[PDB]
Amino acid sequence: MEALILEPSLYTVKAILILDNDGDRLFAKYYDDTYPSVKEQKAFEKNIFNKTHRTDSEIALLEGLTVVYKSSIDLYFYVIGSSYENELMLMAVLNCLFDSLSQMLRKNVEKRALLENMEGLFLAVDEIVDGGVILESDPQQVVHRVALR
């Protein structure tokens, strides 16, 4: 007996990034050995930005990794993961993140609204995922846990 994930040798998300419209790192988190250090993360982030502001936004596939992404006003939002059989988990994390932000910020999740709520954002990520694996997939439940912390 074997399977493609007979062991968790991969992650549903390898990273989550949130960049301002020019590419400034508002937030980033990584769970995978490809980019564990700031210099290589900034390199991957500039790759991400180049590969996406020139593409038909919602998803891309870059450096062998699927990434889903979204943009609003002065903000770009990204979730990066493995490409084993699906991208729906990436869509799940991105939707959970954007909507949980929308509840805590109670704003258009624009640049200043994120900057004002960085801690809430960090704590939402700490409930959406753990160790690069999905942990919760309901945004208002994530928000309840962040609010209750």
Curated annotation (Swiss-Prot):
It is a peripheral membrane protein. Its main location: cytoplasm. Coiled coil: none annotated. The keyword Membrane applies. It comes from the Eukaryota. One of its GO terms (biological process) is intra-Golgi vesicle-mediated transport. GO terms for cellular component: COPI vesicle coat; cytosol; endoplasmic reticulum membrane; Golgi membrane; transport vesicle. The modification N-acetylmethionine is found at residue 1. The keyword Acetylation applies. It is found in: Cytoplasm; Golgi apparatus membrane; Cytoplasmic vesicle, COPI-coated vesicle membrane. Keywords: Acetylation, Cytoplasm, Cytoplasmic vesicle, ER-Golgi transport, Golgi apparatus, Membrane, Protein transport, Transport. The coatomer is a cytosolic protein complex that binds to dilysine motifs and reversibly associates with Golgi non-clathrin-coated vesicles, which further mediate biosynthetic protein transport from the ER, via the Golgi up to the trans Golgi network. Coatomer complex is required for budding from Golgi membranes, and is essential for the retrograde Golgi-to-ER transport of dilysine-tagged proteins. The zeta subunit may be involved in regulating the coat assembly and, hence, the rate of biosynthetic protein transport due to its association-dissociation properties with the coatomer complex. Oligomeric complex that consists of at least the alpha, beta, beta', gamma, delta, epsilon and zeta subunits. Belongs to the adaptor complexes small subunit family. This is Coatomer subunit zeta-1. It comes from Homo sapiens (Human). The gene is COPZ1. The chain holds residues 1 to 149 of 177 of the full protein.
